[PDB]
Design a protein around this ligand. Sequence first.
Ligand SMILES: [Cl-]
Ligand SMILES: [Cl-]
Ligand SMILES: [Cl-]
Ligand SMILES: [Cl-]
Ligand SMILES: [Cl-]
Ligand SMILES: [Cl-]
Ligand SMILES: [Cl-]
Ligand SMILES: [Cl-]
Ligand SMILES: [Cl-]
Ligand SMILES: [Cl-]
Ligand SMILES: [Cl-]
Ligand SMILES: [Cl-]
Ligand SMILES: [Cl-]
Ligand SMILES: [Cl-]
Ligand SMILES: [Cl-]
Ligand SMILES: [Cl-]
Ligand SMILES: [Cl-]
Ligand SMILES: [Fe+2]
Ligand SMILES: [Fe+2]
Ligand SMILES: [Fe+2]
Ligand SMILES: [Fe+2]
Ligand SMILES: [Fe+2]
Ligand SMILES: [Fe+2]
Ligand SMILES: [Fe+2]
Ligand SMILES: [Fe+2]
Ligand SMILES: [Fe+2]
Ligand SMILES: [Fe+2]
Ligand SMILES: [Fe+2]
Ligand SMILES: [Fe+2]
Ligand SMILES: [Fe+2]
Ligand SMILES: [Fe+2]
Ligand SMILES: [Fe+2]
Ligand SMILES: [Fe+2]
Ligand SMILES: [Fe+2]
Ligand SMILES: [Fe+2]
Ligand SMILES: [Fe+2]
Ligand SMILES: [Fe+2]
Ligand SMILES: [Fe+2]
Ligand SMILES: [Fe+2]
Ligand SMILES: [Fe+2]
Ligand SMILES: [Mg+2]
Ligand SMILES: [Mg+2]
Ligand SMILES: [Mg+2]
Ligand SMILES: [Mg+2]
Ligand SMILES: [Mg+2]
Ligand SMILES: [Mg+2]
Ligand SMILES: [Mg+2]
Ligand SMILES: [Mg+2]
Ligand SMILES: [Mg+2]
Ligand SMILES: [Mg+2]
Ligand SMILES: [Mg+2]
Ligand SMILES: [Mg+2]
Lengths: 171, 171, 171, 171
Amino acid sequence: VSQVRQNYHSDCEAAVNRMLNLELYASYTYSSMYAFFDRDDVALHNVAEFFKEQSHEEREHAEKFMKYQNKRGGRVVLQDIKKPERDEWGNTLEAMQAALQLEKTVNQALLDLHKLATDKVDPHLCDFLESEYLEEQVKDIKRIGDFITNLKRLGLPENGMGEYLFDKHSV
Amino acid sequence: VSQVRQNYHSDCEAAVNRMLNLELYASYTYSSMYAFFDRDDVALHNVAEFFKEQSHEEREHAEKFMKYQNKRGGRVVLQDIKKPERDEWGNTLEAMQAALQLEKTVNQALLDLHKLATDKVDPHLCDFLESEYLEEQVKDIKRIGDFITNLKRLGLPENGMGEYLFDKHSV
Amino acid sequence: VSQVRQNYHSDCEAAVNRMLNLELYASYTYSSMYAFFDRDDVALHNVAEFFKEQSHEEREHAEKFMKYQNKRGGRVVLQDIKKPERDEWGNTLEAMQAALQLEKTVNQALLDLHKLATDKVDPHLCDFLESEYLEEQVKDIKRIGDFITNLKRLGLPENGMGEYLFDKHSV
Amino acid sequence: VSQVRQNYHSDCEAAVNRMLNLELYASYTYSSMYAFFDRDDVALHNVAEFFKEQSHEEREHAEKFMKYQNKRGGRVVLQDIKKPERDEWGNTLEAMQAALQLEKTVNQALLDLHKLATDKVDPHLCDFLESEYLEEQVKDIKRIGDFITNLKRLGLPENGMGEYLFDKHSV
Ligand SMILES: [Cl-]
Ligand SMILES: [Cl-]
Ligand SMILES: [Cl-]
Ligand SMILES: [Cl-]
Ligand SMILES: [Cl-]
Ligand SMILES: [Cl-]
Ligand SMILES: [Cl-]
Ligand SMILES: [Cl-]
Ligand SMILES: [Cl-]
Ligand SMILES: [Cl-]
Ligand SMILES: [Cl-]
Ligand SMILES: [Cl-]
Ligand SMILES: [Cl-]
Ligand SMILES: [Cl-]
Ligand SMILES: [Cl-]
Ligand SMILES: [Cl-]
Ligand SMILES: [Cl-]
Ligand SMILES: [Fe+2]
Ligand SMILES: [Fe+2]
Ligand SMILES: [Fe+2]
Ligand SMILES: [Fe+2]
Ligand SMILES: [Fe+2]
Ligand SMILES: [Fe+2]
Ligand SMILES: [Fe+2]
Ligand SMILES: [Fe+2]
Ligand SMILES: [Fe+2]
Ligand SMILES: [Fe+2]
Ligand SMILES: [Fe+2]
Ligand SMILES: [Fe+2]
Ligand SMILES: [Fe+2]
Ligand SMILES: [Fe+2]
Ligand SMILES: [Fe+2]
Ligand SMILES: [Fe+2]
Ligand SMILES: [Fe+2]
Ligand SMILES: [Fe+2]
Ligand SMILES: [Fe+2]
Ligand SMILES: [Fe+2]
Ligand SMILES: [Fe+2]
Ligand SMILES: [Fe+2]
Ligand SMILES: [Fe+2]
Ligand SMILES: [Mg+2]
Ligand SMILES: [Mg+2]
Ligand SMILES: [Mg+2]
Ligand SMILES: [Mg+2]
Ligand SMILES: [Mg+2]
Ligand SMILES: [Mg+2]
Ligand SMILES: [Mg+2]
Ligand SMILES: [Mg+2]
Ligand SMILES: [Mg+2]
Ligand SMILES: [Mg+2]
Ligand SMILES: [Mg+2]
Ligand SMILES: [Mg+2]
């Protein structure tokens, strides 16, 4: 037993490791979206950079879980980072729709972890999730939803002019 | 009944007073460690100053509970501050081990208070503990654990050179 | 065929994708080393931060290959990022030895890619590898070798004082 | 034989002169595109200025070959600069398509020169081409390809609004 460990359930420790992996998975998916929008036959640079930024943010989320694990006396256990679900992302609307679903998947995992922490009476873990993850998730989901509404308004997927306009005025 | 009092259970009010006393007790223990390491036959000034800083921090924790009590309309009730468990602290490793146990004792009391606040449906008290106490406790416990690992690596208690090196490069 | 593609062999495109994956694998291995040295029972913070920095550098190397692929009109294809070979890294010497071998593995892959680029008469790819990868590899290998020599001089793995001294004066 | 001449094959000297001429030809083509987009019945000023900038860049490329020739002890031999293939350039998409093909033609000539330099075992000439020409070519080709993708997305050649938008947000 780690000398620092106090009120940290084995189940929570394991769930933190799984959450870390999911953050890394999300990062990798966003990196794929970056590379797609940087393709010469796609060429939406501001969209690409948005997803690149998101990729870096997700990596930061993962690293914060690593630090958390050690602070509580848990042990970081890593697993493979699975490649993204797709190799190409269609267009800005399709990519944003996938990003929304990804963000909701990550959010659900965070909420499930919060429920576990609650069940195990771990207020430190609850506080950590609330203060460092849950509000950022809601903000990101709202931003992506707002983008999707605008992409639909702009006539995506069919309206190429609309897609250009979004890249030039929304990101 | 205090004109400001709302959703503040008598049990929580009493537990806040006991928590205040424990913070003062912790402060006093750290002050003893400061004085020990400042002895001419001990003479580890950086270690002494670390514990002096910790003593002041614990006093601040106590004063914040006093302010909290009044904000909620509870009444501060003071008890004797018991002298520390020991009059001399052996060496840096022994002192750090005692500090770790002290920090875990304080942490357990904070967690118990959080559980009481939860049982009494007092989200303000829960928030206060989470935002002002629980993360600082985890950080401090991790720091002391890290120090202990390094002191053991440096050959404490036997290795006087190791102890000197710690004082000169870790604190 | 991509409108930008010129003098870019399919074999080189595929090898760039595999190289990208290897950079990501190296990044992930370094992230594991960071987490290990941040453990409360390991607690070598400067060593941990060295490996964290290395992890970020490797990720940058991977992203540069993504950008390269697109610049040439190749298509980024991602695969799983395999978890590191180990879950725990022993001590500073063992970790540095693994880092040296990892760096040499990455270097060999870069040299193999340079040989392929040479065989396919692709001077742009040769230049890219020489200007952006090969010298950094040699520098990193030399730095790690130098560290290993010093860790051995300091009596690793047995000499805990030596390990402490390295953390405090070399990184 | 020039007193400075060393390891500089006659074939390479001649090929450098031909490369110089091609750079001047490219410059002149871009100058024609500038003048076209500055016409009152075309009036896409940002597009015109892009091509004017490209024209100046190509002239700089030519002058660098002149300096190179002298540095190696070769002799600059000039030929007529042929007028561009066209007198009018249709629209932004047509001009960009011609620019892409021009850039690929120049790139192929640079790659052919690099192959000659390799065959004649001239590493100085290889280095010069790699460090001063080949990466700039790849960057320029990618930029123009990206523009073409966006012009097609914007409905060129038919969509005049799309063409206006490109001029106002892409260049
Ligand atoms: Cl526990
Ligand atoms: Cl699987
Ligand atoms: Cl595709
Ligand atoms: Cl928007
Ligand atoms: Cl009340
Ligand atoms: Cl008593
Ligand atoms: Cl004594
Ligand atoms: Cl020293
Ligand atoms: Cl330390
Ligand atoms: Cl090709
Ligand atoms: Cl496999
Ligand atoms: Cl272990
Ligand atoms: Cl060293
Ligand atoms: Cl010669
Ligand atoms: Cl002729
Ligand atoms: Cl005309
Ligand atoms: Cl564009
Ligand atoms: Fe995240
Ligand atoms: Fe798979
Ligand atoms: Fe996210
Ligand atoms: Fe709560
Ligand atoms: Fe909170
Ligand atoms: Fe964010
Ligand atoms: Fe985000
Ligand atoms: Fe305290
Ligand atoms: Fe007593
Ligand atoms: Fe404390
Ligand atoms: Fe503190
Ligand atoms: Fe403290
Ligand atoms: Fe690398
Ligand atoms: Fe595996
Ligand atoms: Fe590396
Ligand atoms: Fe580096
Ligand atoms: Fe490096
Ligand atoms: Fe020193
Ligand atoms: Fe040129
Ligand atoms: Fe003619
Ligand atoms: Fe050019
Ligand atoms: Fe340029
Ligand atoms: Fe150019
Ligand atoms: Mg467990
Ligand atoms: Mg998972
Ligand atoms: Mg917040
Ligand atoms: Mg009462
Ligand atoms: Mg008490
Ligand atoms: Mg906080
Ligand atoms: Mg292929
Ligand atoms: Mg591989
Ligand atoms: Mg270099
Ligand atoms: Mg000749
Ligand atoms: Mg010619
Ligand atoms: Mg260069």
